[PDB]
RNA sequence: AGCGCCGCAAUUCAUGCUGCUUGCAGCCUCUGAAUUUUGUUAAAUGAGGGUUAGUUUGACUGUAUAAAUACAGUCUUGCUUUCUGACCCUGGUAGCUGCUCACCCUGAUGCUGCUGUCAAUAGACAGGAUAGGUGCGCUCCCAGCAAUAAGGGCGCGGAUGUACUGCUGUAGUGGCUACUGAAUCACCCCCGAUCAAGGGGGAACCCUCCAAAAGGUGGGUUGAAAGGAGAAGUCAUUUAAUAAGG
């Protein structure tokens, strides 16, 4: 689970502006935090198929959002994935 | 069916178990995986599928350069040989499956072409129905194997009248019929064949044998990829998911010892039977078995000692032990795998080799087969093969002095027919065939006797355990179980009851039905009905008769047939195959099954 | 209600019984078949989870016999399963982590359903398979909930280029890991083993036998079965995720 402080820090860091809470860039940043933590869990917990179910959802959610961003703008898309460290 | 398996736990100190586990998991199973990969890429692979046969030596040839590859080099000679046998039998299995499926697809595709309705047969013959009926009466009078003979007659007879007459004659089960064709029952029967062709076509897209990766390196690298990389499209992400859901293989492939003397038996000073394997004699394993099997493991030592006392003038061709499989059974709980899992030896024996009379049966079977071989076989190593065969043929004459038990004698005119059904798994009729009289019926309830309550237990547990799995799946709970072992128990109880009744009436044989593939018949029948009832509504079609289709997929007619065949062979009762009639009750089906198998003796 | 199962009762009958004439004719006690009712103080079924290298289901040889098997002697090992008993539980402490929820309507193979102290709110404590409904049981039905089947309705905020997102708490409910609680058994107790390991001591009932009012040698017994296994492919069902399909 994700703390409100880490959540709000993600919001502030990826916001387009101070009241943006839901742009696709903020959404993929939130999902990237979740995917990173859950990958570390599943590397240690291969039999946690319940948690693995969540990963496949989260990876798909981010895949759809990044594909949406990429055809709004490749400049914003490339900058965003570079910040998040996604190849 | 005189080959059976007996098993024992193998016990040894930890360093022996660890060394064997590492040989199996780190070298032998990776070698098997590599052989499966290379064999599936071989340029002759596509012609092996057409022959349905693997070359006798191609796995051995592929393994030779791998025996000194740093990935695989550390193994005894018999472990390489075991890996070869594993891989060779896998493809012998898989190529035989694909070959038969292809023949089924070709056979039914021809039938779909020659299945024409009388409205179509009128046009395609150019003759009135009475005219083709007469021509079918002539062609039947010549073809008098009848089915195959008509299928032979069809192909090269390009004369559309005779060709249509054969089509009409085959539509009716190789016979004349006066009655009119019900056009909707024909259209349904045509549709069944299309579904069967489609389902055969889909089954022929089987995967190549997948192997056992025990490291699961592909899973972890895919996890790192899918979490840090953008998927190029949906199909890459789907392939990632398909890998991430794939479950890890825990256990290596077992070892196979096709030379019975590669298991060397001994008794330790604490009096326990012990075994070691060729190439691993430093690892002594202690035999821990039930007394109900101990007499076999004692026999393995006595057979070994007999041939040593005779300075190898006996043949191991008559050793009661045939081969061994060395298996790790999955342990519950946690530990290092050589501690967690339990090492188990499975020995094939031929039950006839227990007695002296049965050994004489095997000796003649061996002698005839080897005398045939030596005559037909006639290089230096091929001449050495002849000399080994001639040594076997000489040495099988030396007796092991085994227990004498006179062979079963059954009356040729007394048969037991066993009717198999979805509702009543077995029903038997003892028939005196020259008298044409039933000596005894038994129902399923009389066969099970006091065990009959197990049959309601099975139905009740199959319902209950399916529903508990359904509930557990939604929670991702691992606690998913089923009644397969109870079902196996019931089929073995029935098999013993049937054979005991056969012995009691001195039946010469047990008659079993040629059911064919009941599941593909039922599945294509129900689909053809459902497509009429739910046109354009696939989920309605799949809901239709769902529980009947499930019941037919659970019907264990093969396991019951196999259990009967094994028990009859262990008492020397002949098994015969007959055709079960569709008419009548299970009792009448069993009687007419028995009597038809008697009349089919030619 | 429906469906499955269970027995009950009834009819007909042969795989049952009776007879001389051994292939037929009666009958329905027994042992079974055909599915026909019916739920009764009946007789049968009965599904919360777990607990033994448990016992019996063996091998060989001799003797007997019509097989079936039976008796006597010698040997015995612990595997993989199916039942019947008996016993124990309703779990604990830290971590990791999924899913769910703005709100409303409908209600899914959804969730929950025991007893009795206490107790207005809240659940706790002590019992415990008697666990909602019927003879028993269900995904059916009843009652409460339903966000965690599907759908539908409809707020403000972000976003609005096809992605969607927030309203979400010491929250509800799953999974995984580590350690840990009870039975860890086959007549009972105690001390041990668990890749090997057994030892000691008792209670009932029956044999065997001093010549005997009385207890006591030498033993026996204290629930049964089944077995052909590995490897590879496939089908079916269900669950989860994904996609809108070349």
Tab-separated table of C-alpha atoms (C1' of nucleotides) in Angstrom, chain C residues 64-237:
chain	number	residue	atom	x	y	z
C	64	A	C1'	-6.632	-81.347	2.346
C	65	U	C1'	-10.208	-80.478	-1.231
C	66	A	C1'	-14.707	-79.934	-6.803
C	67	A	C1'	-12.805	-74.728	-7.212
C	68	A	C1'	-13.428	-71.175	-3.661
C	69	U	C1'	-10.207	-71.610	-0.434
C	70	A	C1'	-8.662	-73.935	4.753
C	71	C	C1'	-5.145	-75.597	8.349
C	72	A	C1'	-0.026	-76.056	9.930
C	73	G	C1'	5.197	-74.351	9.694
C	74	U	C1'	8.927	-70.626	8.150
C	75	C	C1'	9.670	-65.464	6.689
C	76	U	C1'	7.948	-60.345	6.712
C	77	U	C1'	9.814	-53.667	5.617
C	78	G	C1'	8.137	-48.984	6.649
C	79	C	C1'	5.657	-47.743	-0.713
C	80	U	C1'	1.166	-45.127	-3.252
C	81	U	C1'	-4.066	-44.863	-2.235
C	82	U	C1'	-9.755	-45.846	-0.458
C	83	C	C1'	-12.891	-46.301	3.785
C	84	U	C1'	-14.313	-46.997	9.081
C	85	G	C1'	-13.081	-45.470	14.142
C	86	A	C1'	-10.882	-42.318	17.734
C	87	C	C1'	-8.752	-37.765	18.792
C	88	C	C1'	-7.640	-32.309	18.025
C	89	C	C1'	-9.100	-27.636	16.335
C	90	U	C1'	-11.958	-23.275	15.508
C	91	G	C1'	-5.735	-20.318	16.057
C	92	G	C1'	-1.527	-16.775	17.473
C	93	U	C1'	2.811	-12.842	16.519
C	94	A	C1'	5.533	-9.871	13.081
C	95	G	C1'	6.384	-8.554	7.893
C	96	C	C1'	5.175	-8.082	2.501
C	97	U	C1'	1.361	-7.389	-0.799
C	98	G	C1'	-3.254	-7.789	-4.330
C	99	C	C1'	-8.477	-6.557	-5.006
C	100	U	C1'	-12.510	-3.395	-3.478
C	101	C	C1'	-15.322	1.347	-2.280
C	102	A	C1'	-18.050	9.397	-4.277
C	103	C	C1'	-23.198	8.064	-3.980
C	104	C	C1'	-27.833	5.418	-5.616
C	105	C	C1'	-30.856	1.124	-8.076
C	106	U	C1'	-30.781	-4.045	-9.420
C	107	G	C1'	-28.545	-8.627	-7.257
C	108	A	C1'	-24.265	-12.743	-8.978
C	109	U	C1'	-22.353	-20.469	-8.872
C	110	G	C1'	-21.264	-13.298	-4.270
C	111	C	C1'	-20.710	-13.105	1.411
C	112	U	C1'	-22.836	-14.559	6.299
C	113	G	C1'	-26.059	-18.267	9.024
C	114	C	C1'	-24.000	-23.362	15.646
C	115	U	C1'	-24.856	-23.300	21.439
C	116	G	C1'	-25.072	-20.743	25.739
C	117	U	C1'	-23.363	-16.824	29.289
C	118	C	C1'	-23.096	-12.058	29.389
C	119	A	C1'	-24.351	-7.575	26.339
C	120	A	C1'	-28.806	-1.194	24.518
C	121	U	C1'	-24.396	0.533	21.188
C	122	A	C1'	-20.128	-3.745	20.852
C	123	G	C1'	-18.701	-7.969	20.600
C	124	A	C1'	-16.183	-10.925	24.377
C	125	C	C1'	-15.832	-15.435	27.184
C	126	A	C1'	-16.843	-20.614	27.516
C	127	G	C1'	-18.534	-24.767	24.579
C	128	G	C1'	-18.452	-26.970	19.601
C	129	A	C1'	-19.649	-30.122	14.264
C	130	U	C1'	-25.993	-30.980	16.578
C	131	A	C1'	-24.037	-25.095	12.206
C	132	G	C1'	-30.469	-21.281	8.251
C	133	G	C1'	-34.662	-24.552	5.139
C	134	U	C1'	-36.439	-30.908	4.035
C	135	G	C1'	-34.931	-37.583	5.753
C	136	C	C1'	-30.004	-35.595	3.938
C	137	G	C1'	-27.736	-31.930	0.635
C	138	C	C1'	-27.342	-27.935	-3.390
C	139	U	C1'	-24.767	-23.087	-7.186
C	140	C	C1'	-31.841	-23.899	-5.236
C	141	C	C1'	-34.863	-21.600	-1.324
C	142	C	C1'	-35.199	-18.068	3.401
C	143	A	C1'	-33.063	-13.814	6.225
C	144	G	C1'	-29.359	-9.765	6.474
C	145	C	C1'	-25.450	-7.631	3.536
C	146	A	C1'	-23.795	-6.850	-1.275
C	147	A	C1'	-17.883	-2.292	-3.350
C	148	U	C1'	-15.088	-6.417	-4.330
C	149	A	C1'	-20.795	-10.919	-11.115
C	150	A	C1'	-22.728	-8.358	-14.958
C	151	G	C1'	-25.422	-3.942	-15.937
C	152	G	C1'	-28.028	0.864	-15.211
C	153	G	C1'	-28.349	5.883	-12.918
C	154	C	C1'	-25.991	10.272	-11.481
C	155	G	C1'	-22.322	14.344	-8.517
C	156	C	C1'	-18.438	17.705	-8.226
C	157	G	C1'	-12.395	18.037	-9.128
C	158	G	C1'	-8.446	16.554	-12.674
C	159	A	C1'	-7.848	15.055	-17.647
C	160	U	C1'	-10.612	15.202	-22.468
C	161	G	C1'	-6.531	13.047	-29.043
C	162	U	C1'	-9.029	6.826	-28.421
C	163	A	C1'	-6.145	6.706	-21.505
C	164	C	C1'	-8.765	7.232	-17.969
C	165	U	C1'	-8.409	9.127	-12.842
C	166	G	C1'	-9.703	11.327	-7.422
C	167	C	C1'	-13.561	11.344	-3.650
C	168	U	C1'	-10.292	5.482	-0.030
C	169	G	C1'	-10.252	4.590	6.198
C	170	U	C1'	-6.216	2.516	12.784
C	171	A	C1'	-11.311	0.603	6.164
C	172	G	C1'	-13.565	-4.556	4.192
C	173	U	C1'	-11.586	-9.014	2.390
C	174	G	C1'	-7.804	-12.206	0.097
C	175	G	C1'	-2.736	-14.136	-0.787
C	176	C	C1'	2.581	-14.766	0.340
C	177	U	C1'	6.812	-15.283	3.872
C	178	A	C1'	8.978	-16.324	8.813
C	179	C	C1'	8.139	-18.123	13.639
C	180	U	C1'	4.514	-20.442	16.462
C	181	G	C1'	-0.492	-23.567	19.133
C	182	A	C1'	-3.483	-29.091	19.442
C	183	A	C1'	-4.327	-34.040	18.038
C	184	U	C1'	0.971	-36.343	15.294
C	185	C	C1'	-3.380	-42.060	16.754
C	186	A	C1'	-5.998	-48.097	15.938
C	187	C	C1'	-7.342	-51.377	23.067
C	188	C	C1'	-5.028	-47.545	26.994
C	189	C	C1'	-0.676	-44.661	29.284
C	190	C	C1'	4.430	-42.951	29.376
C	191	C	C1'	9.409	-42.023	27.352
C	192	G	C1'	11.924	-41.832	22.620
C	193	A	C1'	12.680	-41.854	16.817
C	194	U	C1'	11.057	-39.253	12.245
C	195	C	C1'	16.460	-40.343	5.594
C	196	A	C1'	14.359	-44.643	10.623
C	197	A	C1'	13.926	-46.852	16.455
C	198	G	C1'	11.968	-48.546	19.268
C	199	G	C1'	11.401	-49.385	24.726
C	200	G	C1'	8.734	-49.838	29.284
C	201	G	C1'	4.004	-50.509	31.886
C	202	G	C1'	-1.318	-51.534	32.002
C	203	A	C1'	-7.112	-52.736	30.956
C	204	A	C1'	-10.958	-56.013	29.113
C	205	C	C1'	-12.416	-60.946	27.030
C	206	C	C1'	-10.805	-66.117	25.741
C	207	C	C1'	-7.640	-70.356	25.897
C	208	U	C1'	-4.082	-73.306	28.561
C	209	C	C1'	-4.144	-75.803	34.067
C	210	C	C1'	-2.795	-76.706	40.026
C	211	A	C1'	-6.536	-80.762	41.960
C	212	A	C1'	-7.866	-76.171	45.177
C	213	A	C1'	-11.815	-72.202	49.521
C	214	A	C1'	-8.506	-68.768	46.356
C	215	G	C1'	-5.359	-66.475	42.375
C	216	G	C1'	-2.533	-67.512	38.351
C	217	U	C1'	1.281	-69.937	34.611
C	218	G	C1'	2.355	-69.801	28.933
C	219	G	C1'	-0.043	-67.448	25.130
C	220	G	C1'	-3.940	-65.088	22.243
C	221	U	C1'	-7.237	-61.085	20.783
C	222	U	C1'	-9.157	-56.154	21.007
C	223	G	C1'	-11.669	-52.085	12.261
C	224	A	C1'	-11.240	-53.246	7.178
C	225	A	C1'	-9.810	-52.697	1.613
C	226	A	C1'	-6.967	-51.596	-3.149
C	227	G	C1'	-2.653	-51.297	-6.415
C	228	G	C1'	0.965	-50.364	-13.173
C	229	A	C1'	4.054	-46.617	-13.086
C	230	G	C1'	6.702	-42.776	-15.421
C	231	A	C1'	6.886	-39.270	-19.378
C	232	A	C1'	4.621	-36.249	-23.053
C	233	G	C1'	0.325	-34.254	-25.585
C	234	U	C1'	-4.974	-33.215	-25.542
C	235	C	C1'	-10.049	-32.323	-24.131
C	236	A	C1'	-13.669	-30.471	-20.570
C	237	U	C1'	-14.959	-27.427	-16.449
